Amino acid sequence: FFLFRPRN
Amino acid sequence: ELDQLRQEAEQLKNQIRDARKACADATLSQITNNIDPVGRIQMRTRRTLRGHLAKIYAMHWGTDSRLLVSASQDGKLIIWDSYTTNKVHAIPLRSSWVMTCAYAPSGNYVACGGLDNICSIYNLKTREGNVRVSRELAGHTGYLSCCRFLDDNQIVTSSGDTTCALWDIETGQQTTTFTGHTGDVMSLSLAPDTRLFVSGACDASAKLWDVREGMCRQTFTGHESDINAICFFPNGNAFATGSDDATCRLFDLRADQELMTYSHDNIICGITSVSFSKSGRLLLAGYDDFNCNVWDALKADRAGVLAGHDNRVSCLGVTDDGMAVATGSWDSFLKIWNGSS
Amino acid sequence: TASIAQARKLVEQLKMEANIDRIKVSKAAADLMAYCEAHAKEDPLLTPVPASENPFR
Amino acid sequence: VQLVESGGGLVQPGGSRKLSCSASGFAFSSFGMHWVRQAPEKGLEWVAYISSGSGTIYYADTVKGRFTISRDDPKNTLFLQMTSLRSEDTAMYYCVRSIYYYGSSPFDFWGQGTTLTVSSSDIVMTQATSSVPVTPGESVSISCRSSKSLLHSNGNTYLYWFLQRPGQSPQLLIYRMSNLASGVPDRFSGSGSGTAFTLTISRLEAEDVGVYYCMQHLEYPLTFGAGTKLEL
Amino acid sequence: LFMPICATYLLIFVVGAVGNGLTCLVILRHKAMRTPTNYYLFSLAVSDLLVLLVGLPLELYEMWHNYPFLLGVGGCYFRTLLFEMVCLASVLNVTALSVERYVAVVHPLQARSMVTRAHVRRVLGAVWGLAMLCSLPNTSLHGIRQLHVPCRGPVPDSAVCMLVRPRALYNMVVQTTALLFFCLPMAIMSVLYLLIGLRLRRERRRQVTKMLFVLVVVFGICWAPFHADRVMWSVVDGLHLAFQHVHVISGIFFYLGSAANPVLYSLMSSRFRETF
Amino acid sequence: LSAEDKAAVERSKMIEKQLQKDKQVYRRTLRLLLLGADNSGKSTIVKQMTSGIFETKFQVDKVNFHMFDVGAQRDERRKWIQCFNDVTAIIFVVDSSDYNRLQEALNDFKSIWNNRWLRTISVILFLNKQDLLAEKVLAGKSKIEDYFPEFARYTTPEDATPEPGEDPRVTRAKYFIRKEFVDISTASGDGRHICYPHFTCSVDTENARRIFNDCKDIILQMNLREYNLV
């Protein structure tokens, strides 16, 4: 369980 | 008896061939094999002239080696100061489909013509300031293909009417009519002495004409298709030709036959324009490929290429000072090329 | 008819061309080569002039 | 070809006046126009310039702001409106035609003039002498010395020669040294080093009597010489 | 976790790079392919190629190294700005093409107005300037962050690029960009392509009428997951497994679109088929 | 730049302004080349709308048309036809009053169609003088099958809806002429050119509208290809 981050 | 006349014509033609063969003791490639090669000519676009609205058909240099006249099917003759790229004049023409333009050797007049069948002579040095039609010259059951000034008062013209004509500009009348062709005459070249001029035609023959006597002195017949371009060698003893068949040919007046042929199998497109360098060592031709090619006039080897056009080269004029080569194309641009170093 | 006059004109012009005083292609080529070599020094396209004499640069 | 100026007359100091010139017989639109004044019994002096399409306007430093130059191409009329006249502005105002392109002859036509009566870095042009006595048939020479070398990097030497006969507008003889416009080519000629210049008349005639003015055309403040009057 | 995602991404990368390179190379090399109508295609190819190059490689790196951002804070801002700019630029390239292709409804104004390169340069400048200008507001919110105090802190000791400002402002920006650069472009495209199909329907080509809505559908499929990712992150906490799936699938679809744009717009056209 | 060079550049810039101002007009105008034998009513069409070339101008719905008729030029067309490689359409007019003339017209249409330089120019084909064709085929004194024997077997295609009030005989004859030209149209060219056959007569006032619609379609196809839609 690790968080990806939005494609800003 | 017409039959005997045509048989006599056949015998005369065979006599011509026999004499030309007897004069062919050697060939130009054999004689010139020992001469140092030209090397790779790397001419670079020094100026691009971007004024015209449509295809550029013809351009000609003023004797000053600085001013150009350029014709486009929009119906515009733009006179360009090649050194600065400034537009000296924009001449609106009463006929849009203009195929040829000429610059008077004195610089006072420019001629143009095309499918209007009229050679329009424009006065560039009026007191009123604007360029005006000095005269319109009109007799031809055909489009005007090439016009060249002998002087301010005499202009030779060629037309699809199978004839060339020497016009007296002051009176507007044909002084002499040259009638020996059978197809459309497509290009004229005046000899340096202006006593003779050579006309190529769609009949695959180039004929030499005496301007004063009005008679065809010789006929040259080496090509296989229309002779789209013709240019006198600088000494007046030879002239180059270019045809729809992708072959240029160098003819000598004294030898009365082909001396050299310039063709390469990578070329399958017709010559649109031909002109020599000042020394005559380089023959430059436009091709429809779309690039131009520089040929060693004596070694026949392709010495270089001028690539910078997006459509077919239509005109190609080497400056009288030999310092630059102008090249017009249907892409509406003129490129002025000069040596590398 | 026009055909016979046209043929007579053709043969007359052919005779005019036949009698011209031709020279050997050897001498013609020699003359062209001599002119080419004599004026080679003054051909800005064959032998590029320096950038200072070049008017366009 | 005519340039006919209108206006002039007498003006009280500090007033305003509106000179106009009507152009006929030439493509007025394509020509740049100049105003050149001549104070009584003094030399020519440049006033104002308006290029074709009115794209560029220049004034003499002695005129900036005070006078405004405008043109109405469709009416073939040039204008010069003066906002605050001074005694120094009394002069005959000539409308001068100019056209600029390779081989053009600027300052080739001068109107007859309009007499108006009022109740540095500039290139100084010096003419050797105010007067030179001569008789017909003699070769003559007039010389001018500029304060700056007029030989541009382009190779042109922007020096002009004008002849003003009594009661006539100036006539352009040589527009760049050795280029002859209204010439009698067997008679008039000119040459110079780029800082010293000379005009040669090979065989003087009665028609040559008048004041010969040098002009430079390298920098916009256009400066005429004081003029050399040939007398016979 | 990683290897299947890497495989799919690199397949998409090779395919899209081949397509975009081919379209640009054809536009440049052949004399008949530099018409001003082709500059829209070149701009689209460049935009999609930069979307692939800027996103796809660095994304995979993050698929294996979250902690630490490699490119540094200046690189953080530069990457966010460039990526967002190229995405918006691709959207606006497609929309400008749809508007320009509406000339099939007003037939002669294409020749009267487009043939001059001045118009193509003006509209491409509008596209890319708008892309940069509207990219700036979203990118200003991202800045490398790390704040742990070592009470019993974990091993990593590194920092990552993420939202420095409050999540609500990011949500405002994400939803406003989603509206103005997916919903509005979608409406424009749908309406204009309906009209194109309609005026091509007046008779007395079919493939064109089909392909136009193929384009609209591809645009939807490919950009809906992208704004879906951004909105989903902005609106959310234990649910993030769903986001874990959403991000990967949306990446697949978005980069598939970035690779497919060349095939749809330039390569399958009659002109390009005749010059390969 | 010296004082004179600046003014020369100003003149060049004004000339460029004129060249752009008339470039707009040039690119807004549609160029047409009008061809046809002397038997064909080019003159009648132009009257209903530089001896070498006649530039007729006409306007429909505020779109300018230039129509060039090449007159006193020799029949070896091969050369000057290069110039018109960049025209919106070729308007080809053929006299439909059948005689041996019509086969020559078909050969001329072939030569125009298959020309290397016209490889991309559509042909608007006016099968003119329909009134005379109707009168001739109704009188029957001379019948098309005398010159084109294939007409003995030709039967009216069902898909070609006939005009109201026209006899089936006239319809069949005119459709056969139309097909004989269209066959030359379709035998070559991979869609880069399309023929637009139109029947017309001297009294017809609609011809300008027909040319407008045909140029509409031609420009539409050019756009579709240029913008990569097709």
Asked if B252 contacts B31 with a C-beta cutoff of 8 angstroms, the reply is: no
- Separation between Cα atoms, residue D168 and residue D181, nearest integer Å: 18
The answer to whether residues D39 and D113 belong to one domain is yes
Q: Which two tokens mark B333?
A: 């641009």
Asked if F121 contacts F32 with a C-beta cutoff of 8 angstroms, the reply is: no
DSSP H or E segment with residue E273: helix E270-273
- Separation between Cα atoms, residue E190 and residue E213, nearest integer Å: 8
Crossing angle (nearest 10°) for helices F130-139 and F168-186: 120
Q: Which of B259, B249, B324 is nearest to B283 (CA)?
A: B249
Q: How far is A3 from chain E (nearest CA, A)?
A: 7
Taking residue F26's Cβ as centre, other Cβ atoms within 10 Å add up to 18
Looking at chain B from residue 116 to 155, which residues have their Cβ under 8 Å from any Cβ of chain D? 127-130
Last residue of a domain, one of D91, D118, D145: D118
- Separation between Cα atoms, residue B215 and residue E265, nearest integer Å: 64
Partners of residue D222 in chain F, C-beta under 8 Å: 3
Three-state DSSP class for residue B79: strand
Closest CB to E243 among A4, A7, A8: A4
Question: Which residues, listed in sequence order, are joined to residue E66 by a DSSP beta bridge?
Answer: none
Which residues neighbour D230 within 8 Å (Cβ) at sequence distance 6 or greater? D131, D132, D133, D134, D140, D142, D204, D208, D209, D210, D211, D212
**What is the residue range of C40's domain?**
1-57
Spelled out in words, what is the top-level CATH class assigned to the domain B2-338? mainly beta
Q: Which two tokens mark D205?
A: 């005639």
Q: Starting at the edge strand that comes first in sequence, how are the strands of the sheet with D17-24 ordered?
A: D2-6, D17-24, D77-82, D67-72
Which residues neighbour B286 within 8 Å (Cβ) at sequence distance 6 or greater? B229, B271, B272, B273, B274, B292, B312, B313, B314, B315, B316, B327
Q: Which chains would you list as touching D if contact means 3+ CB atom pairs under 8 Å?
A: B, F
The answer to whether residues D106 and D141 belong to one domain is no
Closest CB to D102 among B88, B127, B128: B88
Single-letter amino acid code for the residue at C10:
L
- Separation between Cα atoms, residue B337 and residue B286, nearest integer Å: 14
Interface-testing mutation among C20, C36, C47, C53, with chain B (most B C-beta atoms within 10 A): C36
Partners of residue F220 in chain E, C-beta under 8 Å: 104, 107
Given the structure tokens 């007039």, which residue do they identify?
D142
C-alpha dist (Å) from residue F194 to E91, F123, F188, F227: 36, 7, 10, 19
- Separation between Cα atoms, residue D153 and residue F47, nearest integer Å: 60
Interface-testing mutation among D98, D100, D102, with chain B (most B C-beta atoms within 10 A): D102
Given the structure tokens 């003499």, which residue do they identify?
D60
Number of domains in chain C: 1
Q: Which two tokens mark D214?
A: 């040098």
- Separation between Cα atoms, residue B200 and residue D173, nearest integer Å: 47
- Separation between Cα atoms, residue F168 and residue F170, nearest integer Å: 6
Q: How far is F225 from chain B (nearest CA, A)?
A: 20
Measured in residues, chain F has a length of 230
Q: Which residues of E89-120 are buried (b: 16+ CB within 10 A; e: fewer)?
A: bbbbbbbbbbebbbbbeebbebbbbbbeeeeb
Partners of residue F222 in chain E, C-beta under 8 Å: 111
Q: Long-range contact list for D1-7, CB < 8 A, 24+ apart?
A: D1/B127, D1/B128, D1/D25, D1/D26, D1/D109, D2/D111, D3/D95, D3/D97, D3/D109, D3/D110, D3/D111, D3/D112, D4/D111, D4/D112, D5/D93, D5/D94, D5/D95, D5/D111, D5/D112, D5/D113, D5/D114, D6/D114, D7/D114, D7/D116
The experimental method behind these coordinates is cryo-EM
Residue B237: phi, psi to the nearest 5? Answer: -95, -10
Q: How far is F97 from chain B (nearest CA, A)?
A: 29
- Separation between Cα atoms, residue B48 and residue B82, nearest integer Å: 9
Q: Which of E103, E127, E164, E141 is nearest to E40 (CA)?
A: E127
Measured in residues, chain B has a length of 341
Q: Which two tokens mark F4?
A: 């004179």
Single-letter amino acid code for the residue at D90:
T
Asked if B115 contacts B143 with a C-beta cutoff of 8 angstroms, the reply is: yes
Q: Which of B117, B229, B226 is nearest to B182 (CA)?
A: B226
- Separation between Cα atoms, residue E54 and residue E16, nearest integer Å: 13
Taking residue F154's Cβ as centre, other Cβ atoms within 10 Å add up to 16
Q: Which two tokens mark E229?
A: 């990712």
Q: Where are the domains of chain F?
A: 29-225
* Closest CA in chain F for residue D157: F2
Helices (H) and strands (E) in chain F, counts: 6, 6
Note whether F8 contacts B162, CB cutoff 8 Å: no
Q: Which two tokens mark F196?
A: 């637009």
* Planar angle of CA B4, B7, B10, nearest 5 degrees: 155
Q: What is the 3-state secondary structure (H, E, C) of chain D?
A: CEEEEECCEEECCCCCEEEEEEEECCCHHHCEEEEEEECCCCCEEEEEEECHHHCCEEECCCCCCCEEEEEEHHHCEEEEEECCCCHHHCEEEEEEEECCCCCCCCCCEECCCEEEEECCCCCCEEECCCEEECCCCCCEEEEEEECCCCECCCCCECEEEEEECCCCCCEEEEEECCEECCCCCCCEEEEECCCEEEEEECCCCHHHCEEEEEEECCCCCCCECCCEEEEC
- Separation between Cα atoms, residue F218 and residue B82, nearest integer Å: 39
Taking residue B88's Cβ as centre, other Cβ atoms within 10 Å add up to 23
Q: What is the DSSP string of F26-82?
A: HHHSEEEEEE--TTSTHHHHHHT--TTEEEEEEEETTEEEEEEEE-SS-S-TTTGGG
Q: Which residues of E223-255 are buried (b: 16+ CB within 10 A; e: fewer)?
A: bbbbbbbbbbbbeeeeebeebeebbbebbbbbb
Q: Which of B133, B135, B98 is nearest to B117 (CA)?
A: B98
Partners of residue A2 in chain E, C-beta under 8 Å: 66
C-alpha dist (Å) from residue D122 to D219, E243, F24: 8, 78, 45
Q: Which of B184, B179, B181, B157 is nearest to B168 (CA)?
A: B157
CATH code: domain of residue D33: 2.60.40.10
The answer to whether residues D7 and D91 belong to one domain is yes
Last residue of a domain, one of D97, D118, D139: D118
Q: Which two tokens mark B209?
A: 């004409």
Note whether E111 contacts F222, CB cutoff 8 Å: yes
Residue D104: phi, psi to the nearest 5? Answer: -70, 165
Note whether B16 contacts C25, CB cutoff 8 Å: no
The answer to whether residues D74 and D167 belong to one domain is no
Q: What is the DSSP string of B216-239?
A: EEEEE---SS-EEEEEE-TTSSEE
Asked if B250 contacts B259 with a C-beta cutoff of 8 angstroms, the reply is: yes
C-alpha dist (Å) from residue D125 to B151, D43, E132: 41, 12, 58
Three-state DSSP class for residue B341: coil
Residue E16: phi, psi to the nearest 5? Answer: -65, -40
CATH architecture of F29-225: 3-Layer(aba) Sandwich (3.40)
Number of domains in chain D: 2
Asked if D114 contacts D6 with a C-beta cutoff of 8 angstroms, the reply is: yes
Q: What is the DSSP string of B1-62?
A: -HHHHHHHHHHHHHHHHHHHHHH-SS-HHHHHTTSPP---B--EEEEEE---SS-EEEEEE-
Interface-testing mutation among C32, C35, C47, C57, with chain B (most B C-beta atoms within 10 A): C32
**What is the residue range of D158's domain?**
125-230
Q: What is the DSSP string of F96-137?
A: -S-STHHHHHHHHHHHHHT-STTTT-EEEEEEE-HHHHHHHH
Last residue of a domain, one of D100, D118, D136: D118
Partners of residue B311 in chain E, C-beta under 8 Å: 31
Note whether B86 contacts D26, CB cutoff 8 Å: no
Q: How far is B267 from chain F (nearest CA, A)?
A: 17
- Separation between Cα atoms, residue E198 and residue E213, nearest integer Å: 12
